[PDB]
Ligand binder design. Structure first.
Ligand SMILES: C=CC(=O)NCCCCc1nc(CO)c[nH]1
Length: 305
C-alpha cells in the first residue's frame, strides 16, 4: 500500500551497554551491531538468531560497517583505532592506528579497497584495506567528525561535524570539492549520500533532517516531527518498498517519512531509550533499530509495503 505497516517481529538482547550502530550485510544474511560494551555481535537478519561475538577493542565501539562482499567488517573505537575483521573467523585482520582521539564513524568504499574514518581529533583518514596503512589524513573539520560516507562510484567522500559544516572530498586527491552546509551552528550530526549519489541526507541537532542536491548545493526536502538535539542518530533511505526516510529519535521512537511528501507515515513504539541507529534491509521491507543504555536491545520490524 501507500504507507508502511512495520510491526515488531524480534527483540535481540545481549549487549551489556548502549548499542551504537546496526548495519545489515549487503547480501542480506546478517545484522552487525556495535556497542559501548567493546563488542560486535552478528545476528540472523530474518530470525534475529544470535550468531557470534567479535572481541578485541580495548574501549567502546561507536560504529561498524560491512565490505561490499559481506566478508569483512570495520569498527571505530574509543581506543583510537579501527579494526578490520574477518566475519567468518571472527579474527582481527588489521588494526588501523593514527587517529589521536576516539574514532567515531567509518565506512568502506564500494570497491572495498579503502576505509574512511572520522574522529574526535577533527580529521578524516583514508586507509588501505590490504595493508592497513593510512594513505591520507584530511584536516577536514574544526570539531569532532560525526559521519563519513562514500558515494556510489567511490570518487567522493561526504563528512559532517559539530563545527556545523558538511564537506565533500575528492577521494583520489583528498582535496575539498564543496562545503555544502556552511553554518557556525547547528552541529551536523549525520550525513550520507543517496543510493544514486545525487543527494545528501543531513541531520542537524535542531530536530531537523534535510535532503540536499549535491550538484546544485540546494535543500530539496526537510523532515521534522522527531527529537534530535544531542546524539548522532543515523538516517536511512528505505528503497525496497515505498520510498521512505527512516530515523531514530530521542523520544524513543523510529520515525518513517514519505521522501517526496515529507509527511510522517509511521512511528514505531517499543524502545525504552533513545533510538540511536536504524538500518534498512537491502532486499526485504525490514528495519533494525537499536537503543541506548536504559534499553540495550535491537528490534527487527517488518512491513508488507
Ligand atoms: C553524541 C555521541 C553519540 O551519538 N553517541 C552514541 C553512539 C555513537 C552513534 C554513532 N552515530 C554515527 C553517525 O555517523 C556513528 N556512531
Amino acid at each position: 500500500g501507500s504507507k508502511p505497516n512495520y510491526a515488531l517481529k524480534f527483540t535481540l538482547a545481549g549487549h551489556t551497554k548502549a548499542v551504537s550502530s546496526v548495519k545489515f550485510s549487503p547480501n542480506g544474511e546478517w545484522l552487525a551491531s556495535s556497542s559501548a560494551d567493546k563488542l560486535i555481535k552478528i545476528w540472523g537478519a530474518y530470525d534475529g538468531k544470535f550468531e557470534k561475538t567479535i572481541s578485541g577493542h580495548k574501549l567502546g565501539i561507536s560504529d561498524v560497517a560491512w565490505s561490499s562482499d559481506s566478508n569483512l567488517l570495520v569498527s571505530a573505537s574509543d581506543d583510537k583505532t579501527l579494526k578490520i575483521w574477518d566475519v567468518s573467523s571472527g579474527k582481527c585482520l588489521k588494526t588501523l592506528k593514527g587517529h589521536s582521539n576516539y574514532v567515531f564513524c567509518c565506512n568502506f568504499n564500494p570497491q572495498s579497497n579503502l576505509i574512511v574514518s572520522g574522529s574526535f581529533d577533527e580529521s578524516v583518514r583514508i586507509w588501505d584495506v590490504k595493508t592497513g596503512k593510512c594513505l591520507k589524513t584530511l584536516p577536514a573539520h574544526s570539531d569532532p567528525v560525526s559521519a563519513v560516507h562514500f558515494n556510489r562510484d567511490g570518487s567522493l567522500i561526504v563528512s559532517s561535524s559539530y563545527d556545523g559544516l558538511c564537506r565533500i572530498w575528492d577521494t583520489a586527491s583528498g582535496q575539498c570539492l564543496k562545503t555544502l552546509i556552511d553554518d557556525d551552528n547547528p552541529p551536523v550530526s549525520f550525513v550520507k549520500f543517496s543510493p544514486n549519489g545525487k543527494y545528501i541526507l543531513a541531520a542537524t541537532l535542531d530536530n531537523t533532517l534535510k535532503l540536499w542536491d549535491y550538484s546544485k548545493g540546494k535543500c530539496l526536502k526537510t523532515y521534522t516531527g522527531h527529537k534530535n538535539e544531542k546524539y548522532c542518530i543515523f538516517a536511512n533511505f528505505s528503497v525496497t518498498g515505498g520510498k521512505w526516510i527512516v530515523s531514530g529519535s530521542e523520544d524513543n521512537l523510529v520515525y518513517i517519512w514519505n521522501l517526496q511528501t515529507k509527511e510522517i507515515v509511521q512511528k514505531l513504539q517499543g524502545h525504552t531509550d533513545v533510538v540511536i541507529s536504524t538500518a534498512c534491509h537491502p532486499t526485504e521491507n525490514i528495519i533494525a533499530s537499536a537503543a541506548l543504555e536504559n534499553d540495550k536491545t535491537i528490534k527487527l520490524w517488518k512491513s508488507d509495503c
